[PDB]
Scaffold this active site. Sequence first.
Site, mmCIF file in Angstrom:
data_model
loop_
_atom_site.group_PDB
_atom_site.id
_atom_site.type_symbol
_atom_site.label_atom_id
_atom_site.label_comp_id
_atom_site.label_asym_id
_atom_site.label_seq_id
_atom_site.Cartn_x
_atom_site.Cartn_y
_atom_site.Cartn_z
ATOM 1 N N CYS A 128 22.047 84.766 86.705
ATOM 2 C CA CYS A 128 23.422 84.991 86.442
ATOM 3 C C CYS A 128 23.916 86.528 86.690
ATOM 4 O O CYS A 128 24.949 86.935 86.467
ATOM 5 C CB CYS A 128 23.696 84.597 85.070
ATOM 6 S SG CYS A 128 23.939 82.885 84.587
ATOM 7 N N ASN A 186 30.507 77.721 81.821
ATOM 8 C CA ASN A 186 29.800 78.861 82.403
ATOM 9 C C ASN A 186 29.271 78.436 83.840
ATOM 10 O O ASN A 186 28.577 77.556 84.068
ATOM 11 C CB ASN A 186 28.329 78.858 81.544
ATOM 12 C CG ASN A 186 27.365 80.080 82.100
ATOM 13 O OD1 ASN A 186 27.301 80.500 83.149
ATOM 14 N ND2 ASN A 186 26.559 80.261 81.013
ATOM 15 N N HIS A 209 29.499 88.383 82.670
ATOM 16 C CA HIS A 209 29.156 87.248 82.797
ATOM 17 C C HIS A 209 29.696 86.142 81.621
ATOM 18 O O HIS A 209 29.568 86.468 80.469
ATOM 19 C CB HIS A 209 27.576 87.039 82.830
ATOM 20 C CG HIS A 209 27.266 85.615 82.934
ATOM 21 N ND1 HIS A 209 27.563 84.368 83.579
ATOM 22 C CD2 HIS A 209 26.219 85.039 81.804
ATOM 23 C CE1 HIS A 209 27.085 83.440 83.273
ATOM 24 N NE2 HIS A 209 26.163 83.723 82.395
HETATM 25 C C1 LIG Z 1 25.918 74.038 73.744
HETATM 26 C C2 LIG Z 1 25.352 75.155 72.860
HETATM 27 C C3 LIG Z 1 26.454 75.454 71.515
HETATM 28 C C4 LIG Z 1 25.652 76.647 70.638
HETATM 29 C C5 LIG Z 1 26.673 76.932 69.523
HETATM 30 C C6 LIG Z 1 25.922 77.831 71.534
HETATM 31 N N1 LIG Z 1 24.996 77.879 72.762
HETATM 32 C C7 LIG Z 1 24.658 79.039 73.421
HETATM 33 C C8 LIG Z 1 25.218 79.496 74.629
HETATM 34 C C9 LIG Z 1 25.139 80.550 75.460
HETATM 35 C C10 LIG Z 1 24.077 81.436 74.912
HETATM 36 C C11 LIG Z 1 23.377 82.667 75.532
HETATM 37 O O1 LIG Z 1 23.323 83.633 74.780
HETATM 38 N N2 LIG Z 1 23.652 82.638 76.770
HETATM 39 C C12 LIG Z 1 23.032 83.791 77.695
HETATM 40 C C13 LIG Z 1 22.690 84.839 77.582
HETATM 41 C C14 LIG Z 1 22.411 85.884 78.575
HETATM 42 C C15 LIG Z 1 22.160 85.478 80.044
HETATM 43 C C16 LIG Z 1 22.753 84.159 80.279
HETATM 44 C C17 LIG Z 1 23.176 83.368 79.199
HETATM 45 C C18 LIG Z 1 23.957 81.960 79.607
HETATM 46 O O2 LIG Z 1 24.521 81.010 78.791
HETATM 47 O O3 LIG Z 1 23.951 81.733 81.116
HETATM 48 C C19 LIG Z 1 23.411 81.028 73.641
HETATM 49 C C20 LIG Z 1 23.747 79.863 72.865
HETATM 50 O O4 LIG Z 1 22.972 79.812 71.722
HETATM 51 C C21 LIG Z 1 23.070 80.397 70.626
HETATM 52 C C22 LIG Z 1 24.264 81.458 70.459
HETATM 53 C C23 LIG Z 1 24.226 82.127 69.272
HETATM 54 C C24 LIG Z 1 23.378 82.097 68.160
HETATM 55 C C25 LIG Z 1 22.322 80.893 68.094
HETATM 56 C C26 LIG Z 1 22.244 80.306 69.476
HETATM 57 C C27 LIG Z 1 25.582 76.449 73.682
#
Ligand SMILES: C[C@@H]1C[C@H](C)CN(c2ccc(C(=O)Nc3ccccc3C(=O)O)cc2Oc2ccccc2)C1
Lengths: 320, 320
Positions: free
Chosen positions: B112, B275, B245
């Site tokens: 990404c 995304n 991003h």
């Molecule tokens: C479908 C799931 C639903 C949950 C609530 C969120 N999910 C999440 C969606 C995205 C991320 C996330 O940090 N993503 C990323 C971080 C760095 C680089 C790329 C990404 C990417 O998604 O492409 C993290 C997730 O999970 C958490 C977020 C905060 C605390 C704990 C976990 C997607």
Amino acid sequence: KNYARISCTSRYVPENCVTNHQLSEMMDTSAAWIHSRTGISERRIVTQENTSDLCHQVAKQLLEKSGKQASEIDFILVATVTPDFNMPSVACQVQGAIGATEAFAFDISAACSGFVYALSMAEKLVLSGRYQTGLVIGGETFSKMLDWTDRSTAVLFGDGAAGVLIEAAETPHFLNEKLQADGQRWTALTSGYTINESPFYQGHKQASKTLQMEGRSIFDFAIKDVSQNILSLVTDETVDYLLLHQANVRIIDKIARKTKISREKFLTNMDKYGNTSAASIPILLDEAVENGTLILGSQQRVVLTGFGGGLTWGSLLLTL
Amino acid sequence: KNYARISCTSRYVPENCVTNHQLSEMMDTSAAWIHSRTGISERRIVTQENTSDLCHQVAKQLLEKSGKQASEIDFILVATVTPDFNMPSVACQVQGAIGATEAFAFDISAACSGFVYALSMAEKLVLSGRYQTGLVIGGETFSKMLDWTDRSTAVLFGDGAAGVLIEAAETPHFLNEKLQADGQRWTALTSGYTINESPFYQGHKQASKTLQMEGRSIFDFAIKDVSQNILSLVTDETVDYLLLHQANVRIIDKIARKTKISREKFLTNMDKYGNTSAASIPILLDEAVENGTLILGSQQRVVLTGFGGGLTWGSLLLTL
Ligand SMILES: C[C@@H]1C[C@H](C)CN(c2ccc(C(=O)Nc3ccccc3C(=O)O)cc2Oc2ccccc2)C1
Ligand SMILES: C[C@@H]1C[C@H](C)CN(c2ccc(C(=O)Nc3ccccc3C(=O)O)cc2Oc2ccccc2)C1
């Protein structure tokens, strides 16, 4: 100091050595015939290593040879079309393996032209003045992309990786370049197709994912287009050595005649490695430096010429 | 004229629109819950197109908008981790599709962060003075890399592509940059593993090949490391807009607080796209330009910030 320069070279191939004799048994062909069709006697094939592992050793060896710290690397570029994953990149796995915490990294996809393309990139990166020290490695494990029953391709490829340490010089080394491509003939050489099987896909696209090549087509392409590309940078009178992609020696035999450049100037080393794709030029380079044919700092006018899937092809003219 | 400049923007997403309502039926979840967990209402998913097709339309649209001839393109760079084949590259398929016979092309693998990385590349290429006109496109079809039963990831991604026309300007636009990576955490986000099944492989490596992510881990990574990376180029007082991003809006919510930069400055648009990985920033960019939020030639200080698998991350500071 903003002039890219190849300071060190290094190569690494799997320890597992596969001779034509073993392949003649595996398949139902003669070693003698495998030898005369390929110009290869033996090749290395991974038994436990993946592209990143091969590239890891190259980087590790480059660091030890030069005495550089992994922390002094500003960037890591890897030319490959057989990466462990699409994500992360092999360049990132290497960056982590050797602990080059201060380097950003990514892979470049340009088939067998990848090393030349990557080298062109590093030159641009160093020219900018923002980066001075990098590692440019070409590595592949095509053995996992082949149908080991089809004796018209499998016998052709070997595994391995090689690269160089690039640093900012006071005087220019990368004299000229000419990178090219022709996507209108991309079907001539393909590998790694990924079928879309989401509940939304309606196409009926299928592809074994194993390498597919139109030999005569790409052979003719190399002879005509690579010859022209080489002649746009040098003539026999202005070049000492040429390191082309090790796809087939006969391509070199014919290109030397087409371009009228002394045949002994084209270095070759397929016998023990086979076609190592992106790794072919840097492996050849490390060997030629290792045995004293090529001499770093000698000012020998050298041309690096890759060509492959894409279609892609390009040359770099440098003074070692 | 050796200063890279974004002259045109353009985006292209599959016509097939998949709402949370359809996904709640497919899976056994509520659309309401899919919405609150993702911040997405609907997304586009390919039904017959592959990454190259999406990137093809973007290039085709960029060419028509600018009035440029495919023959005037010097280079084509595509950021992707879901290419049709490993070889040829998507950049080569596009080069052939639009007939950019005078352009060399290749794909860049930086997850990404790919678009930002590719943009940095084009800047270096144009700086050299050898190339003036290029197309930098970020495109993905991650829908073919997902397990559409696991509702903790599938509901997160959309398909699409977007890019820009880059040409040599008289005055600088790309003011600063900071590209980074950390391969010591590459296991946090992976996809596209290829099993080696040659008669020589002795390892027992297996991997579904579908995307795998440690949400909390990468979420924390983004908040800590991306914030620091952004603060190394600007402060609230020296930036007008930031296009990060589009992974998760809450990351942006927290990064704005961490960096103390006005929240309204971070543009977002996940609602209709989800995304879209490498395509996220250029899609967001094209929309912001299209509706007049961002104005080309206005000198707005804009930061483009990508982050993803590798681990990779990096920002570009420019004056539009
Ligand atoms: C479908 C799931 C639903 C949950 C609530 C969120 N999910 C999440 C969606 C995205 C991320 C996330 O940090 N993503 C990323 C971080 C760095 C680089 C790329 C990404 C990417 O998604 O492409 C993290 C997730 O999970 C958490 C977020 C905060 C605390 C704990 C976990 C997607
Ligand atoms: C195992 C087979 C044995 C045959 C005799 C040679 N094969 C061949 C091996 C290599 C090539 C060839 O042109 N290769 C390439 C040309 C451009 C870029 C890359 C390659 C590459 O091999 O990676 C072409 C081959 O086939 C022909 C050569 C001349 C005339 C007709 C076909 C390999």
